[PDB]
Amino acid sequence: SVTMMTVEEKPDVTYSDVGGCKDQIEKLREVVELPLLSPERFATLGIDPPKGILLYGPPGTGKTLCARAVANRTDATFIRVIGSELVQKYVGEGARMVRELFEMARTKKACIIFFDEIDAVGGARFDDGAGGDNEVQRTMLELITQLDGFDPRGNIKVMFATNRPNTLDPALLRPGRIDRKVEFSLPDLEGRANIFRIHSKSMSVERGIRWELISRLCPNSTGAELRSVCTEAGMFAIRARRKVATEKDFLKAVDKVISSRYMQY
Amino acid sequence: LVYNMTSFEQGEITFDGIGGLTEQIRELREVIELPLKNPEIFQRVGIKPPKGVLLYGPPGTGKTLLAKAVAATIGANFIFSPASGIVDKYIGESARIIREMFAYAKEHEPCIIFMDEVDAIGGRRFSEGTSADREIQRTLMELLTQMDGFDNLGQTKIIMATNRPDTLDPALLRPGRLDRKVEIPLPNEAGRLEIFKIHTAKVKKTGEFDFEAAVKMSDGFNGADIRNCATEAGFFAIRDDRDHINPDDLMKAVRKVAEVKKLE
Amino acid sequence: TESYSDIGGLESQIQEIKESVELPLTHPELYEEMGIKPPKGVILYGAPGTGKTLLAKAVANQTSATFLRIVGSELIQKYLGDGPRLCRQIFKVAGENAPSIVFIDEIDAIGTKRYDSNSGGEREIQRTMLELLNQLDGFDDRGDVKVIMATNKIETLDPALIRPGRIDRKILFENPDLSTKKKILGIHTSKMNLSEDVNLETLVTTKDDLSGADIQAMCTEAGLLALRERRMQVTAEDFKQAKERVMKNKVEENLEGLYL
């Protein structure tokens, strides 16, 4: 029932609005689209693609948007198995949903799902197997009982997520269970220079700007600390009451979010 | 049942169908059977019957088969409490388990314990993590008071099996109880055929005898060796679908399987 | 219930919440003119006795919107699976009652590292810290509901939720400087007599390593300390004995005096 409610229904986001991760998609859409779009080229060799890929990275690194960016692109059912909908009390009422979860998926074709932040349930590695009753132990062993032991299905794509991978089992690095461990990690300069531009489309700044200065001025940072720049940079002009942005404004916007001097250089 | 077998006081394994000893088993005949047989003397002297015993030595000796066996002669309930399988990381709940069993033993009318690997209790405390080692004595110390409080019964006997004696020196717990501490043997070369005579029975094998077996059993003096050689020597006469053993398989068995019983 | 004209000091700190909350309801055409939308989130560092909760309750006085009342520990529950539902409840209703504000305080109760425990109860908060994340930025946008969260120490706490997407500015407070102690003192004392002794620019001074809250104790501890002398109005030396007291056991520099 409730599982029918959680469905994507078309958020608006492209792959044009993502930058430095110009190759890490080339692993992600290699497993999702092609077996669902172009399975013949694998078939020309005739092998089993991976299914049940994963992605891990630091926080704010830009992974959730991809998981919805892939939704509008595929024109296929996107399913969100989010938290607070798998670990309800009254045992049997918790782990039945995951059984019912796949059952919708086993029925339907051309289907892919999403598990947001599996660190809740999968991350609950049994504390030395302790606890005479472990409500999460039983419901984690079922999906691997769904996915390993014997084949769940043949055409369904799965992607997990994790801000913190070391929690969950050593059984979720293993075929059937899991195939790939993608790693989103911090950008480089040529990525950042293509993350600024998208967040500054709407912005009403005038040219005379060289973001090459800025990326050399913004060290190791996330893909979300680079939008907050665009807020505060655009904001200082507001308390100073100007109808346009400068470049120098960024230079004292950058100083805050990253945050007395190393005079020895 | 929940915990252990309890043997229904009559499951009668043969304490003499065994290549063990006569002196030790007769040393135990004193502390258990004599009072339960003959209270007319301890009463006459007024001494209370004894308080438990230790049986050191590493395995192969059969330091658990005799125990439940003589318990079967007298007919008490035989159970376990392996201290390796009693420790729990939580603060209490290692002592609770101690408290259940002294109670639950008394829920039954007779009952006797078989603790094993009790060095988990008696540790040297070389780490000295006071968050832990303050508790290690806490659960241990509860044993000392849970074991001999008001219990004036003549049924609730105690045993503790402890490989590696004297590894414990936080406390030797000497004074009072442990009225014996048996000087355990190992299987002497004379006892080999005393042992091989045990398991060889119940077989039609054209004999399968030899004096080249104790030499083979030299340094493999553990009861599992003989149990297993008779096992696998039984698996070689069928290796060719034969009808009866040859003793060369025994001279082959112990020579070629005590290897693991001497290197690891 | 309080208002502005009751702080005086915090000015470099206060312009932000204005820019987050009090303003955009008024003149959002500013933000869009640039092509920009304001923050969804705020946080306030600790350094206690410096006026954190005071600021939040101020804006409630004039906000023209719905405002909420939570401390970090009302979230948690007992039945092991009902906590995290409660978080989604408060955010959806705020949307139903939008435009709205929340205020979760002392959330060091909740916010801790992924400690990877073995208890059985400390897990059910980590999930409760997590639906928040999955709710707050998560997968889908939420609209115009703003967070003003607070704490007292963060230097090893509040692991991951502290990032853009969820929170954007990190105001911090400390014990004030000399310049602010001037005007803040006028605040409390603007109802008493102050007979003739004022001299206030030496009363408060550096090396009085005190707070921005103890001063009202000093203000009030003096009046009765003069009342008991049957003198309702006040002089200076009323305050001198007070400052002698309340400062006594804040700090001691016995380990100082080495950097000669």
């Binding site: - | 990381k89 | 007992k78 039945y79 092991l80 073995n118 208890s119 109860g121």
Partner: peptide, 16 residues
């Protein structure tokens, strides 16, 4: 059907 389970409703636990 009032087989209302105790819900496995958690509780703290001291360590080590």
């Amino acid at each position: 059907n009032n087989e209302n389970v105790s819900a496995r409703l958690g509780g703290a636990s001291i360590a080590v």
